[PDB]
Structure formats: C-alpha cells, structure tokens
C-alpha cells in the first residue's frame, strides 16, 4: 500500500494536488496506503528514473501492474474510483 | 547577417550560405523514408565531431537502440559518442494505457529531463524526433499545444540550436501544424518515382533572414551519409595551362599546331557505331600511361577483359599498364546506379586515384537513364569537376553534327566517319574545332591496323 | 513489443487504404521495414511492382522492381544486379557461310 | 551492420542486402490481390525448408 | 532470338530495353553465342 | 583570353587597362530573372558602348 506523488515546485497545481490528496485520503477513506511526495525540481534525474512526463502525477506500485493518474486530482469521486480496490 | 551552424553536409551548407540558423528552431518535413531522422543524426554528429558542440537527441517514438543502429551503418559511432557523452539520447515515451487524466497537467517532466541532459552534456544542439506521438498520447490538445509552444520558446530562450522532425501529411507540409510554430527554416525532403526510377530531392521552402537556394536539389545517401552536389555551385574559374598533351597518334598530333590539344581541356570524340571512338580513347589512355602518368577509363559498354582483347588486336597492350598500376578500368553499366551515385562514384574514385587523363566512354549511354535535363546536369557536373581538377577529359559520344547539347562546352572535337561510297566503306576523321590553336582543315582518311591508327598520306 | 522482446522475425500483412500506405495506421508502429506491392494497369497491360519504401539500418534498392508470380513463386530479376564481369574467350564460331566467315 | 533473414526470393534478398531484418517487425502493404499473403507464405516456407 | 524488334509495342521503350539487356547479360554471363535479329526502317532501338 | 591570343586579339590589354569587362557566368548559376537582373544592373553600373 504505497503511493508516490511527483510534483515540481510550489506550483498551484502541485499544492492543490497534495491538498486534494490529503482531502480524498482522509475524509473519503481511512489510511489504507502511505503517501510519499517527491518534488522533481531538486532531482530532475529521478524524473528520468521513474519515467515521468506530465506534472502532477500520482503513481501506485503496490499491484504488479503499475497505474498512474495525471493531474491535480480535482475530481474526488474519479480519483477514489481510480484508487479503489 | 545572422548566425549559422554548419551541419557537416557541404552541399547543404553552401546552399544555405552557412547552414541552419543558430539559436532558432528548424523544421524538417517529409513522408516516411525521406531521411529526416538521418538528417538530424548527421546534424548532431557533425556538430559534435567538427565544430565541438555537444548534442542532445530527444526521441518520442524510436528507442535509443534503434537510434544508434540507424546510423551505425553510415560509419558514425553513437555508442562511442554517448560512451564519451558528446551526444545524450533521451527516449521520452508515454504509455496512455496506465494514464488517467484528472485536472490540468503540464509537461514539466519533459523540461526537467531535457534540462538535465543539456547540463550533463554541455549540449548546444538539440534534435526533437517524432513529436506527433506526444500529441497522440495525451487527450487534451490545448495543453499539449501550450506546452510545446513553451518548449520552443524555452529552447530559444536558453539559446540552443534545435532541429524538429515532422511528418508531411496530406494538405500542407505538416500534419500537426508545426509550421504555425517553426518558421525560421523549413526543409522539405521528397522521394519521387518517375518511370520506375526513384530519386530523393531536398528543397528549402522558407529560410527567414537571408538568401539561399530555392530550386529542388537531388541528394544522395551513401556510406558517408548525406551528399549534395548542387548544379548551381559550378563556376567558370578554370586555370588554363600552356602545355600540350599527346594523343598517341603521330599523324593526328602533327595535324594540329603545337603537337596536340591543350592540357586539361575537354575533348569530344563523335562518330557512328564502329567508327573507332573507343580505339582513339584507348590510344589516348595508353599514350598517357606510357609517359609514367596515371589514367582512368570509365566504360559503360564493355567489360575489362573484353576491352583488353579488343584493343590487343589494335596492339594497344592495356594489360601492361593496368598490371603495372597506371591504368584503371571501371566497366559499370548505366543502370547499375542512379545518376547521383554515378556522379558520386566517378568523383570519389577520380579524387582517390588522382589521374592525369579520364576517358568516359560513352557519354551517350545515359540517354534513357533520365530526362535530358538530369543527364545534362550530371555531365556538366562531371566536366566541371574534371576541368577544375585540371584533368584531361576524353568523352566518347555516338552519332546519328550535334548530339546531346553537351558539345556546347567542349574545347576540342574530333569526328570519325565511316562512309559507304563506291560499294565499299572508308574511314576518315577530322577536327571539327580546336580552341586556341590553328589546325588542319582536311578530312584525313585513316586506316586502323595492328600498328594502330595510321592516317594515309 | 513482446514479439521483439522474445526475438522472433515477424512479417505483418496490412491493406493500403486511400491516404497512406496503410488504412489502420500500422506504419505508426512498424518502421523497421516497409514493402509496398502494387498492381498497375497501363494500356490494358497489368504489371506487378515491388518497392522498399523504408528499410531502417542499412542501404538497399530504392527503385520500383517489376516482379512475377510463377509456378516457383515470387521471382525478382532486378535490372540493377547486372554487372560487367564477362569472361572472354579466344575461340571463334562458324556462321555456316564460308564466304562470310572468311571475310573476317 | 545488422542481422538479416533470407526469404528464399533471391532477387528480393539481394535487393535488401541479405533479406528482412532479424528480430524486427516488417510491414507488407498493398491493395487486395497484390500478393502479401503469398509473400508471407513463401517467407515462412523458405525459412523452414 | 528472332526478332528482338517484335516486342516494340508490348510496353514502353524502357521496359523492353530492360528485358533485352537482362537477356543479353544472362547469355553473356553464361558464355552463350547470342544471335539477335532486328528489323530495319543504321540505329534501330538503342540496343 | 588564351583562345583569342592565338587570333592576336589581346583582350588582356583592354581588361587590364579597364575598358573591357568579362562575366563568365554559367546559364544554370542563376534563375532567368536573376540572369536578367544581374545583366541589367552591371550594364547600368558600367555604362559601356558595346555588349556582347
Ligand atoms: N586489327 C585490326 N585491323 C583492322 N581493323 C580493326 C582491327 N581491330 C579492330 N578493327 C576495327 O575496329 C572496329 C572497332 O573499333 P572501336 O571499338 O574503337 O569502335 P567504336 O566507335 O568505339 O565502337 P562502338 O560503337 O561499338 O563502341 C572494328 O569494327 C574493326 O573494324
Ligand atoms: N547505410 C545506408 N546507406 C544508404 N541509405 C541508408 C543507409 N541507412 C539508411 N538509409 C536510408 O535511410 C532511410 C530512412 O531514414 P530515416 O530518416 O531514419 O527515416 P525517415 O526518412 O522516415 O525519417 C531508408 O529509407 C534508407 O534509404
Ligand atoms: N499458382 C499461381 N500462379 C500464379 N499466380 C498465383 C498463383 N496462385 C495465386 N496467384 C496470385 O496470387 C494472388 C493473390 O495473392 P494473396 O497474397 O493471397 O492475396 P493478396 O495479394 O490480396 O494478399 C492472385 O491475385 C494471383 O495472381
Ligand atoms: Mg524517421
Ligand atoms: Mg566502343
Ligand atoms: Mg491477401
């Protein structure tokens, strides 16, 4: 149960992304998985290592098949459905 | 004036008057197989290996293995140039299967990775290959449009020389409207088939900031890579020589004042089939060889052995000079190559061998290889190259007098006639014209035998 | 990707269409080698031609080569393969006309 | 250089300088009746035999 | 081969010339004596 | 020059004194429009009495 959130800088998109992640994770459901936030600007290399293109990105690696979600996570219901199991 | 970055391709560079603009984006349009990827690859390779500018190759479709293997055959070593980091390859691939879009996204990782590569390699040149896959992957079109407009602005903003590969499409020179964006330089590559013969052409559609060539220039991809020998680069600056050359026929040599035709001149030998044009050319080559000089005999009609045993009847022992290493035979059919590769091979081997007499027999064999204009362009390029090198060119042409519009340049003209009169055939020859000297105006009948070509009294 | 990944040599058959060399955009995918086959009629005579549109990684023929399907199958005798390497012989042949033979 | 797989067709093989690339996909385009199916069939048959 | 001129209208000049050149080259490589008969109307067909 | 020197016409003398001009331009060097433009421009600039 691990989730990674790739963002770049104190951007409105990334800030809203992490805030919305907080909201969906807490109000919608319990703490089933642990979140880790990585800001790409300091480590551009990690962007290549994880093959990231469009900010912001939310990637789950718990299941064998990877799954990514691109954007700021504005739609709570869609984010929850994409992250539900 | 404006800055310009050479691309290694001498013909393209001199056509553009320096090369692509420096610090501006360039668009390379053309259907699949035209050579846009190779164009960008040699761009980067030549920039790194000749002008000391690091390069970055951002590919959106092809993997680094494919990118390296494509140019591996051309003689470049992308493995070594990356193994040394002079060119940095970034395979920026996006898979829409595991992508779900919620909210607004910016192609920030693209910029971060490209900046990381640029700082790693100290790059000054950048190539963007297959940027249409970027549009095909993501769903929102406006976001992608804005993102790469920002990307082009950012590339200009930090001042890198960028070349973009784009497909042609159906309506305009691009199918994704990258012309809207890149107008500093547009180069269209075309691959057209006519009469079953396919040729590759290059055109500079729009180059903003200075003059350039506007015609369609046929180019070739060879072991070296891109090669462009435009017909507009030929100039009439030919250093003349006051020495004379020996044809090998004493009577013909004495017929003209000075002992022979001026050295480095273009000599045409015209006549009907069986007149003896090849015999005269062989006489010229053998006479040049006997003096210790090198000679080449390009033949588009006969094999080396057949020519040998044809001339051995006339006594010219071409085997001796070929075996001692002073005479070269090619024996190449007109249809073996295209016109561009015929020109390129002739030029390359002439430069490598550095001979003193080149005999092309016959120049009329290229009649149906293409249109009259293309063959004339090839012949003019060959003649100008030989004259600039100061080599004596002996061209043999068949007669049916004016033949193909290439007599227009020849310095000397020798017509060989085999006429039927009084129920029997007689041979004759005469100098139709000999520039810069006085010569006999008699139709001297001759008779070929074992001793060679001999003019009757 | 999986076929390349386990390393098999694969040949894909695709229809032409109307706009490009393929109607389903398989050119987007396969660029290692593209071979276009055409069957064109001129003056009521129909001929079959083959062309290598794009072969990535090395040189190749670029012209349109007329080919034939016969009992053996595909047969291609390109006119670009002919070379001027002909071993000559010093013997003579008899035409059957003594006067013509002696004339030379 | 790169690997190449002969396809039995001598003319096509010598045109391609060895044949189709080995380990890579090849596309055969053409309208109905051009001979793509037969091309693939002889490819396989010659490769096996 | 009698006559090589019979193929005049079978196709364009280039195609017939290609066929004739291939035949001649094949015969010469095999070292066979080729006797081609052509009709006259001198140069006939560029072969 | 060395073709005419055989006929005795010493064009070098007049070219060197500055009364004769030679262009020596190939037909394919320019397009027709630029051939015309260059000819007109140089003729106007030099103001000669005989153009061959
Ligand atoms: N020993 C010899 N004695 C007399 N004539 C000879 C001798 N050897 C060759 N010839 C003549 O040379 C002619 C061929 O000359 P050559 O090959 O130079 O002609 P060409 O103009 O180059 O011909 P083509 O149009 O076939 O290229 C033969 O037809 C024959 O008439
Ligand atoms: N070693 C080589 N010699 C001659 N031509 C080559 C060589 N390698 C590749 N080519 C040419 O390059 C072409 C493909 O070039 P590329 O630019 O990669 O594709 P595209 O033109 O579709 O962008 C092939 O169609 C082939 O004619
Ligand atoms: N025994 C044969 N001899 C000559 N040609 C044949 C023979 N069998 C099939 N053909 C040719 O093969 C063609 C069909 O080939 P195929 O590749 O199966 O179809 P397509 O070209 O539509 O893929 C026919 O149009 C025919 O000309
Ligand atoms: Mg390409
Ligand atoms: Mg000859
Ligand atoms: Mg079929």
Author numbering:
A (entry chain S): 3 to 87
B (entry chain G): 2 to 401, 407 to 463
C (entry chain H): 154 to 257
D (entry chain H): 2 to 50
E (entry chain H): 361 to 401, 407 to 412
F (entry chain L): 309 to 360
Q: Any passages from the paper?
A:
Here we investigate the primordial circadian clock in Rhodobacter sphaeroides, which contains only KaiBC, to elucidate its inner workings despite missing KaiA. Using a combination of X-ray crystallography and cryogenic electron microscopy, we find a new dodecameric fold for KaiC, in which two hexamers are held together by a coiled-coil bundle of 12 helices. This interaction is formed by the carboxy-terminal extension of KaiC and serves as an ancient regulatory moiety that is later superseded by KaiA.
There was no interaction between neighbouring KaiBRS molecules within the complex, which suggests that there is a non-cooperative assembly of KaiBRS to KaiCRS. This result is contrary to what has been observed for KaiBCSE and KaiBCTE complexes. Our data show that the post-hydrolysis state in the CI domain is key for KaiBRS binding, whereas the phosphorylation state of KaiCRS has only a marginal effect.
